[PDB]
Every structure is written in C-alpha cells, then in structure tokens.
C-alpha cells in the first residue's frame, strides 16, 4: 500500500512524493503483479534522480521481473545513458540475460546507442553474447548499417 504509492510515484517521476514515501518507510523493493520494482519503473521512464534516491536507499539493483528483466535491461533499451551509468555504479549485472534472450549490450546495439555501448563495454559487457537468433552485438550493428558502432565493437 505504501509500496503501491511508491511504485506509482516512481513511474510518475514524482520526486518529492518518492522522498516523502521513503521517509514514511515505504519498501524500496516493493514489487507489482508483473514483478517490477520502483527501480524498474523509474529506470524505464528516464527518472534519473528517482533512480539515484532509490539506489542510495538500498534498492535491489538486480531485481528481475516476470520476464527476467532487470532495471538495466529497461534503461539500456530506452537509451537512458545516465541511468545506465547509475545502475552500473551500484553493481548492476552487466551481462544479465532476461527470459527473452536479451542482454544490455545487445539491447543498446539494436537501437544504436553508442555511448551506452561504450559504458557497458567499460563495465565488462560480453561482446560474444548471443541473441536468440545467434546474433552478437557486432552482427546487429552491421545489419542496421551502423558502421561507427561496428567500429567500437571491433
């Protein structure tokens, strides 16, 4: 119930409300029916300062939802550079596979997010990770004709 308001405040990006709910003892690791946490919802909707307040308040950085996605999965997918960095600084599993065969590196490669790819590589992203179709980060970059990214992945 306090958790529900926290989930919604995070999805919303209601910073002040999030801080109030934290102060009132809301469970930072509360999860909804799809197994998504406030960290999932903030990370996905680009709410950096909420992501950071959640992280500093011991949110499970590697919480997985109903299809095995972590907050890093969602952030990499949506192109949130600073959030990806924030997640990684708190020990996000850089090479985590969700139940759909996605890794953060491959998600970022797919959508052409160069800076994110570079940060993931810096944190030890596995360049040999196979998407369900047997495609790696590099393979995906060529098929999309993104040659600058292909260069980075070498």
């Amino acid at each position: 119930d306090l958790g529900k308001k926290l989930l919604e405040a995070a999805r919303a990006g209601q910073d002040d409300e999030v801080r109030i709910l934290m102060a009132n003892g809301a469970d930072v690791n509360a999860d909804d029916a799809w197994g998504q946490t406030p960290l999932h919802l903030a990370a996905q909707n680009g709410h950096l300062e909420i992501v950071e307040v959640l992280l500093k308040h011991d949110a499970d950085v590697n919480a997985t939802d109903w299809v095995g996605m972590t907050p890093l999965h969602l952030a990499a997918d949506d192109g949130h550079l600073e959030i990806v960095e924030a997640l990684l600084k708190y020990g996000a599993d850089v090479n985590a596979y969700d139940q759909l065969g996605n890794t953060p590196l491959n998600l970022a490669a797919t959508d052409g997010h160069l800076e994110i790819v570079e940060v993931l590589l810096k944190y030890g992203a596995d360049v040999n990770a196979q998407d369900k179709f047997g495609k790696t980060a590099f393979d995906i970059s060529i098929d999309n004709g993104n040659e600058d990214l292909a260069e980075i992945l070498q």
């Binding site: 909804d32 029916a33 799809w34 998504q36 109903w66 299809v67 139940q99 759909l100």
Partner: protein, 141 residues
C-alpha cells in the same frame, strides 16, 4: 449466465504500443499512440487489471511476450486482456521490424494451451488497419 468474478484479481492486461518502425518496413510514426496507451493504462487499471505497457516491439518480441503471458499462472485471476496498437494489414499486425499474423499471438491462449484461463474470458483489443479500404459514409436523408 455470468462469468465468475469471485477471484483474488481481475487479471493481467498487456499493452503493446508500437510507435516507431524500422526504416526497412517503410512505415511512418504513429503519433498520438502514446496518449492511447496512457489513457488505456488508466482505464484498464481503474477496472482492476494489473497493466503493463511495452513500446516498439519487434514481431519476435510480441510473440514471446504473449506466449510468456499465457504461461503465467492465472489461477487467481478472473480474466485476461491484451491491447495491440500498431500499423496493420488484413489478418496481420506490424512489429517494429515487419508483419506478424494476429492469430499466432492469440493462439497461445487457446483452451488446450492455456489451462489456467480455461472458461475465463480472453479479451483482445486491436487498434490497427485491416486493409486500405475507406468508408465514404452515407447521409440519412
């Protein structure tokens, strides 16, 4: 004569909001679809569904999500809902990378394939073109 609603949860509702499409498909941006997905998120939440929204899904990602959604345990749910918002053609709907049969998506929920929704309503709301024909209308004179 009425579906049993005496369950812990009304049920799950998954929304696929496809707005942006790969250059290879040649399909344009679906502006206004974000408002659709947000308004539907609110309405369906208000009815009691636990709602989730996935944006810009490839065909494979749509297939997998729906398949996975059918593999959830719906024992304590009264029903299930799916909302598809995308470009479309006859019998078919667009992922970001191409076209997929609508019947492939719903198939996972058939009585013999999804036991925990058996005898429960399975609802699919589909906002997509189904061909290129235009209704010119007619005046009541």
């Amino acid at each position: 004569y009425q579906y049993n609603m005496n369950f812990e949860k009304l049920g799950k509702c998954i929304i696929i909001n496809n707005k942006n499409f790969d250059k290879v498909t040649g399909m344009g941006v679906r502006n206004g679809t974000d408002k659709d997905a947000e308004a539907l998120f609110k309405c369906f939440r208000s009815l009691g569904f636990d709602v989730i929204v996935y944006n810009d899904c490839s065909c494979a990602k749509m297939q997998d999500l729906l398949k996975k959604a059918s593999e959830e345990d719906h024992t304590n749910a009264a029903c299930f809902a799916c909302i598809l918002l995308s470009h479309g053609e006859e019998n078919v709907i667009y992922g970001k990378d191409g076209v997929t049969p609508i019947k492939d998506l719903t198939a996972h929920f058939r009585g013999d394939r999804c036991k925990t929704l058996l005898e429960k309503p399975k609802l699919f709301f589909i906002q997509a073109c189904r061909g290129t024909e235009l209704d010119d209308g007619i005046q009541a004179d």
